Every structure is written in C-alpha cells, then in structure tokens.
Amino acid sequence: HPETLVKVKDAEDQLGGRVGYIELDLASGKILESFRPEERFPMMSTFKVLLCGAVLSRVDAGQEQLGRRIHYSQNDLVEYSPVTEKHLTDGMTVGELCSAAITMSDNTAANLLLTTIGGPKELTAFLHNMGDHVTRLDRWEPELNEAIPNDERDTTTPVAMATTLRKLLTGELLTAASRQQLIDWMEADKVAGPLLRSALPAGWFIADKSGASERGSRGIIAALGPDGKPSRIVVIYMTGSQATMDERNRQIAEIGASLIKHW
Ligand SMILES: [Ca+2]
16 A cells, blocks of 8 residues: 555665665656665676677677577586576577576576677676666676675666666667567566566566575566556665565565555
8 A cells, every 4th residue: 555665665674775766657768756766786687688688789780699509518507597407408599598597597598698798898888888887797697696785796776777778678779679579588587476476467568587696685677567568667676684585575576566556
C-alpha cells in the first residue's frame, strides 16, 4: 500500500546499507521518481546487459556475428557457469553466450564475451563512447562481484544505468533488430523470479536482469509495462547491509508491488 518512495526508504531502514532507486519514462526519458539517484552502487551481474549491448554494436558495425561459434576449454570455466560447463565439446555461438550471460547470469559466458571485445576496459570505452562517463567496469567474473565497500570499481549510479539502458533499448545507437534482440534476451530472464516478477500482474511485459553478491548487495534493472509493452525503466540497487538474501529479495518484491499498485 505504501507509496513507492516510502517503501524504498523503509527497505533501507530495515536492511541497513543503502538502497538506490529510479523510475524513468521510456518514451520521454523523464525521471518520474528516485532515491539516491546519483550515488554509486556496485553493478554486479547487471553489467551483463551492457556487455551484450557492446556486442550487438559490433554486430551492427559488421565486426561480429551472433552465429560465430566459440570453442573453449575447462580451463576457462569460472564459478557459476551452469550453461557453458555443458558445452565443452560443441561450444557456443556469440548469440548463445549472450543468452546465457543474461538469462542465466552465466559467468564464463560473460568472460568469453569480454575477451571478444578486449576486456573490461574496452567495455568502459564503449560506455564513454555513448555518453556514459559514470558507469565503469574494471574486473572480470567473479572478482568484479562482492564487493568491498564503496570502492568505485565496477560501479554505476541509478540514473546513469537507467539513462544508458534507455539509450540501448530506444534510440538509434543500435539497429532496430539489435535493440529487439537485447530486450528479447532480457524478457527471457530465468533467474529473477523472486524479485519484480513475483509482483507483476497478468498481461504485463517485463524484461530484466538481476545481480547479487554473496553478502551485502543485490540489484535489478528492468523495462516493464502493462498490455504486453514496456513503458518504464526501473533500477534498484542495494549494498552495504548484513541482511540475508531472503530479506533482500523480499524488500525488492515489496518495492515492486508498490510500483505496480501506484502505477
Ligand atoms: Ca536511510
């Protein structure tokens, strides 16, 4: 029942640490509501959407193909690689790797993709090149995660991430086909059930990507809207608390319910 902003502040009171929140209109790009919009939070696995954005950009520039098959070895596997560990013989295409990174948060998939473009620093250059001088990626998986306190490495701000996500999903930075492919992968997210999706009514569209660090942090970026069409971008970051994963998940779910009931 509580207003979104009230619920967000409540969440922070309960969890400790900091909670960052922003809602932007997809069409206009106007900020509808926010909390700690310009403060830095760790991106965690939410960066994987940006990564595949840079990938699709290379596809649009004719420097990459989603169908290009990549072979790797057991030496390349890092923690949490549910998809890539199953394809040591047949490998995976660039498209499949992006699907795995986004829909399953596969870590090796992200690392392989990062190699195709020259590493974390090259992703940062891509961000700078599209007008995002705030967001920065510094490390690989899984080090880029968890999460030492307000160390600026591998961080963004609610408003920076939201603005950058809007530029990727709308506008002419990517071709229409690539824009659709990006949101398609996000729609198929398979590991964000307990979050915003748990509070979404029937017939609503949602495309999202979550992130998490063993202890302290949690995040979700999403494009959602009623009647099977996305109309708003929501970004929620949490960090610096000693609360359990269950509590973190619950608070996000409650913030999502407030957003919907007050749409
Ligand atoms: Ca507070």
